[PDB]
Amino acid sequence: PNTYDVTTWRIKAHPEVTAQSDIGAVINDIIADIKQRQTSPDARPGAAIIIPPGDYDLHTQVVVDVSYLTIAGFGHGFFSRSILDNSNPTGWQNLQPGASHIRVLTSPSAPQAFLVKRAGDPRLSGIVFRDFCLDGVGFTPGKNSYHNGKTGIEVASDNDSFHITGMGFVYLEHALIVRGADALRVNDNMIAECGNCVELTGAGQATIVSGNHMGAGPDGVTLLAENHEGLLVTGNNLFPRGRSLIEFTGCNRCSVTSNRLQGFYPGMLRLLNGCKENLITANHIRRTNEGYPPFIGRGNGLDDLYGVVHIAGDNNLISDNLFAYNVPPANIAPAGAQPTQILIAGGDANVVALNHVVSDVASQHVVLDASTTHSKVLDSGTASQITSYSSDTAIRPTP
Amino acid sequence: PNTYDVTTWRIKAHPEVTAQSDIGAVINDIIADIKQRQTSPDARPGAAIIIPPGDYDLHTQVVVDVSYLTIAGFGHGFFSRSILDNSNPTGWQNLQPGASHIRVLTSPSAPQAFLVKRAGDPRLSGIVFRDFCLDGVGFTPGKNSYHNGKTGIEVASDNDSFHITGMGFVYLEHALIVRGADALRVNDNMIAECGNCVELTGAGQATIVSGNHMGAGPDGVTLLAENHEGLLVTGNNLFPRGRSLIEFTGCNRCSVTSNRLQGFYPGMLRLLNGCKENLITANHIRRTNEGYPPFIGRGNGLDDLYGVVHIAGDNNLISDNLFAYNVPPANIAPAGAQPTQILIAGGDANVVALNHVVSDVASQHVVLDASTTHSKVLDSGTASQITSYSSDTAIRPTP
Amino acid sequence: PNTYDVTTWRIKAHPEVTAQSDIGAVINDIIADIKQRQTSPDARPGAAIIIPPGDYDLHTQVVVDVSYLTIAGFGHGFFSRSILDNSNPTGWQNLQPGASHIRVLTSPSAPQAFLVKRAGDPRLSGIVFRDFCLDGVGFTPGKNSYHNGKTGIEVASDNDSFHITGMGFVYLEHALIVRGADALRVNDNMIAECGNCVELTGAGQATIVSGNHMGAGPDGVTLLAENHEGLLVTGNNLFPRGRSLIEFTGCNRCSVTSNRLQGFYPGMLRLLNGCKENLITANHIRRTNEGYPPFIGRGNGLDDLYGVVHIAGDNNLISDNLFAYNVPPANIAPAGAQPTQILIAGGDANVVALNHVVSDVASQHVVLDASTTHSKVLDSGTASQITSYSSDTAIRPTP
Structure with a gap:
């Protein structure tokens, strides 16, 4: 009851249109049958659509x-199309993603493989997307462009209690997008080799993003949050080459803790457009240079004075973080400049404590620009590893 | 084998008593069939009971x-009954919780939808409750009373290695209760609009409560732990309006890290009746005033001198936490008083370090009561933001 | 499609060889049918093998x-064989592990129940092992030897995006072994009463180990990592009696945060053979004496001067940790000696800040060996609770 398997369900008016040829058509016909059956606002339990191992x-x-719609598969089936595209496929035993593998071949006029939205009142709630694979197949014009105009899952209407787990997103310009997320949960997912990984736009409340593996594109974001409050980002392993790895614009009282960050460019962690009262702590932040040839020489347009961590807002606490910076003097922007680990771009009352920096070159662990006021820097470097362009800054040397 | 679907299983002596009319009766008959079949202590594998999408x-x-009994569904199907009850339902497309939706209509003499217990020896082990919904339907007498005498899942016997994940609990006076929990795991659940969310009573060992979304009631607890040791509470997003959000009574060596806490009342984090050697760190603690009208004016009976964080015990380490306190001068109890962020009620050797406070009013970041001895306060406020009623307190100003 | 249930699948050449008698044979015949069918490198989706509740x-x-092979069951079915083996089974209602229970009865020539490996190019990817049980049945010669030569799951070839969740491993000499892990995820598992729990050998990148429950053997490791980079170990509850609980050899830039550690021996946390730039923070570390008689008197061969936390490497940051040490003066090795909480064995630039120690005896919170250089000790003990055998050490007293 209320359980469908995409492979057994025939479209009455279109019999040879199968999950193999157009699973999109199949799922839309199933949803049509669900609405067929559940007409009572007091009797709309929802259903589950199972996607068997396959292409x-x-x-x-x-x-x-x-x-309360659940679309589930049996695996994330991730597979690095990036390495395939930049390698010699001869004798390769696999050329494509697996598990419950959905190849997104969407047309410009309808980008998103899945678009969740509904007008009218009750906001959509309890929708679950899990354990299956969304593959964008390839990048266009350049095979390494991270562009293709496709999106995996997009939530355009205010939603409550959505759950996104065990998924596999690959080679999509935008993997996951969720506007007006409330009590959202994105956890245990593998989102990589995408132009953009997770985009929480519009605004949000008490959202949790944990246990995820993410890697974006040079012109994209890994994790982006817009006007969020109560966001918890924890236990994630974010790796190479978003323009940023974590980017908040105007979010307040959020927390980024116990994470592993690795980027090849300036501004891996960004608190922009006045983010207030956020906690960034217990994270491992490593900045280094791009190591895979196909992408060598590409950047995010920022220089090393932007800072690995860029904060523009008030009362944020950046502490107990470990910074590992290894970048060739020759790749450092501007020539002769000392890389900035933590840049307090503007804002009042920011506090920077117990931040260990390890760098191959002379670097300013913390820089407080002349716009800042009443900042606090404790045990985050010697006096000559700290630049304060303000005069009310209180600094305490790491002995 | 050993797999049942509640919708296909007929009760031999009672044929029209279906999962729809009394899933409780159905599951009991299934368990009776399991015991029927597995009579050998050396041959009791258990079974899985699947609950299809439905009401x-x-x-x-x-x-x-x-x-080793597994009861699983296809979704948590949460839905805010609170908002429905305080809104105008006209034209609403949904009026109830979904997914594998179980409406708890229990009688006073048997409150709990599920009561796990067994006499004799081997303690119960490996029981798993997952991906389904428990809905208390409504609150009684007042629609906003958070009272109805119903409980979702209750474990009354000593248990080992229980697993509670992907659940949806709503409008229950008591969502989940687990006595004598050992190696228990509560993770990835949505427990809200319940009088009480998670209650670990009796005593406990090496339990993990993470990745959960919880919201309780004014007269209830969000997360409560009794005489626990080795408890790890991490990556949870605890929001509004338990009387407390985290409450330990006599627990020792437990840890509360990387969490997001939001409350509308005094004492969101409580360490009572001599809790010893616990770590409370890397948490975002936000106290503010109740914003939803139906509940404006209701409290937990505590004043602002109780402290957002209340500690009564020895050798606990409260550090690297961010306190965001926004409360109208007029809602502050007692009139004229300065809100206390951290109150060290009694105890020896407590240590409070690197705790950032942000508040709209003059507040005492840390208060050490006259009962305290040998406390340590480092970088948690200026001398005038710290009150020590003891004389052996060692304090180091945030410069 | 591509979905098998171990109990319904007959081996054409060997009909009475069932999942009950040799599930190993059954699964191998299923994989043979998968390869039978998916012969195209461009059409190898994989499949799912379901293991019904049973023995x-x-x-x-x-x-x-x-x-992209997924082998899943309906439960972890953990059961403490250790307690059974050291107790009186009379009238016991259970004598064995449950759920999707696989009893590993492997021969010396093929130790591993599951051996994942493949030659040729594409590295194996997307393999998922979940929600089932691997039981070694018993230890041999001694019932409490933690030796039996059996291994549960072993990955011997370079792999990508593997996922291991919801598992139950019990009484296995080696529970899980994964060489060349990349973007691996080990989470939400119960691995205990095993000689060794999780072994990430060879080398690794961006791996996540979280939400797990682990307990090993006196001669084994709980969590071991070899030449890993980007490892995140968070939210785990590691309990008694590995020789260590977390052991890294030559790993760089890894992070161990928000964990609960409990051991009965010296060196519960080890950073050996030059581990560089790692973050160990927000962890609860509890060292005490063995309490279960069958194992009293057995050790790991190390003395209390090895330190609960042993660091040999450069630029590591051990901070915001709570140490609870309770050990009988008489069990302390060498007689008269003061237990060492944190030992910086060798290395350059290690930083030790805000580490609270609680112990029943006089103890050296931090010891910097004569090999160390440029170490930093802040707020981790009074001057007499800190021993520096170097002269370039910078120390700041906990007031």
Whole structure:
């Protein structure tokens, strides 16, 4: 009851249109049957759509407008298309992603493989996307462009209690997008080799993003949050080459703790457009130079004075973090300049304590620009590893 | 084998008593069939009971007395009954919780939808409750009373290695209760709009509570632990309006790290009745005033001198936490008083370091009561933001 | 499609060889059917093998050589064989592990129940092992030897994006072994009463080990990592009696945060053979004496001067940790000696800040060996609780 398997469900008016040829069409017809059956606002339990291990083409965009809809598979089936595209495939035993593998072949007019949205009142709630694979197949024009105009899962209407777990996103310009997320949970996912990984736009409340593996694109974001409050970002392993790895714009009282960050460019952690009262602590932050040839020489347009961690806001606490910076003097922007680990761009009352810096070159562990006021820097470097352009800054040397 | 679907299983002596009319009766008959079949202590594998997407009524309490029993659904199906009850339902497309939705309609004499217990020896082990929804339907007498005498899942016997994940608890006076929990794991659950969310009573060992979303009631607790040792509470997003968000009574050597806490009342984090050697660190603690009208004016009976964080015990380390306190002067109890962020009620050797406070009013960041001895306060406020009623307190100003 | 249930699948050449008699043989015949069918490198989605609740004997080793293979059950079914073996079974209602219970009865020539490996190019990817149980049945010659030569799951070839979750490992000499792990994820598992729990050998990158429950053997490791970079170990509850609880040899830039550690011996946390730039923070570290008689009197061969936390490497940051040490003066090695909480064995630039120690005896909170250089000790003890055998050490007294 209320359980479908995409492979057994035939579209009554279109019999040879299978999950293999257009799983998008199949799922839309299943949702149509669900709405068929559950007409009572007091009797709309939802359903579960199971996606068996296999290769499926999605040409038709799926519009999800029923609450408590669960689309689940048996695996994330990640596979590095990046390495395939920059390697010699001869004799290779696998050329593509697996598990419950959905190949997103969407048209410009309907980018998103899955678009969750509904008008009217009750906001959509309890939708679960899990254990399956969304593959963008390839990048266009350049095979290493991270561009292709496709999106995996996009939530455009205010939603409550959404759950996104065990997924596999690969080669999508935008993997996951969620606007107006409330009590959202994104955990235990593998999102990589995407232009953008997770985008929490609009605004948000009490959202949790943990246990995830993410890697974005030079012109994209890894984790982006817009006007969020109560966001918890923890236990994630964010690796190479978003323009940033964690980027908050105007979020307040959020927390970024117990994470592993590795980037090849300036500004891996960004608190922009006045983020207030956030906690960034117990994270491992490592900045280094791009090591895979296909991408050598590419950047995010920022120089090393932007800072590995860029803060623009008030009362944020950046502490108990370990900074490992290894970058060739020759790749450092501007020539002759000392890399900045933590830049307090503007804002009042920011506090920077117990931040260990390890760098191959002379570096300013903390820089407080002339816009800042009443900043606090404790045990984050010797007096000559700290630059204060303000005069009310209180500094305490790491002995 | 050993797999049942609640919708296909008929009760031999009672054929029209379905999962829809009394899933409680259905599951008890299934357990009776399991015991039927597995009579050998050396041959009791257990079984899995699957609950398909749907609306099911539970009138009969389920007594779970077999080890390794798995009851799973396809979704947590949370839905805010609170907002429905305080809104105008006209034209609303949903009026109820979804997914594998169980409506708890229990009688006073058997409160708990599920009661796990067994006499004799081997303690119950390996029981798993996952991916389904427990809904208390409503609150009684007042629609906003958070009272109804119903409980979702209750474990009354000593247990080992229990697993509670992906659940959805809503409108229950008591969502989950687990006595004598050992190696228990509560993770990735949505427990809200309940009088009480998670209650670990009796005593406990090496338990883990992480990745959860919890919201309780004014007269209830969000997360409560009794005489626990080795408890790890991490990566949880605890929001509004338990009387407390985290409450330990006499627990020793436990840890509360990387969490997001938001409360509307005094004492969100409580270490009572001599809790010893606990670590409270890397948490974002935000206290503010109740913002949803139906509940404006209700409290937990505590004043602002109780402290957002209340500690009564020895050798506890409260550090690297961010306190964001925004409360109207007029809502502050007692009139004229300065809100206390951290109150060290009694105890020896407590240590409070690197705790950033942000508040709209003059506040005492740390207060050491006259009962305290040998406390340590480092970088948690200026001398005038710190009150020590003891004389052996060692304090180091945030410069 | 591509979904198998071990109990329904007959081995054409050997019909009475069932999952109950040799699930190993059964799974190998299923993999053979998968390779039978998916012969195209461009069409190798993989499959799912479901293991129903039950008791299954594994005599034949399973060789997993297909990408995106998912083997899942309905439970971890943990059960303490240790307590059974040291107790009086009379009237016991359970004498064995449950759920999807696989009894590993492997022969010396093929130790591993599951051996994942493949030659040729693409590295194996997306393999998922979840929600089932691997039981070694017993220890041999001594019932409490933690030796039996059996291994649960072993990955011998370079792998990518493997996922190991919801598992139950019990009484195995080696529970899980994964060489050349990359973007690996080990989370939400119960690995205990095993000689060794998790062994990440060879080398590794961006691996995550979180939400796990682990307990090893006196002669084994709980969590071991070899030449790993980007490892995140967070939210785990590691309990008694590995020789160590966390042991890194030559790992760089890894992070161990928000964990609960409990050991009965010296060196519960070890950074050996030059581990550089690692973060060890926000962990609860509790060292005490063995309390279960069968094992009283057995050690790990190390004395109390090895330190609960042993660091040999450069630029590591050990901070915001709570040390609870309770050990009988008489069990302390060498007689008269003061236990060492943190020992900086060798290395340059290590930093030790805000580490609270609680112990029943006089103890040296931090000891910097004569090999160390430029170490930093802040707020981790009074001057007499700190021993520096170097002269360039910078120390700041906990007031």
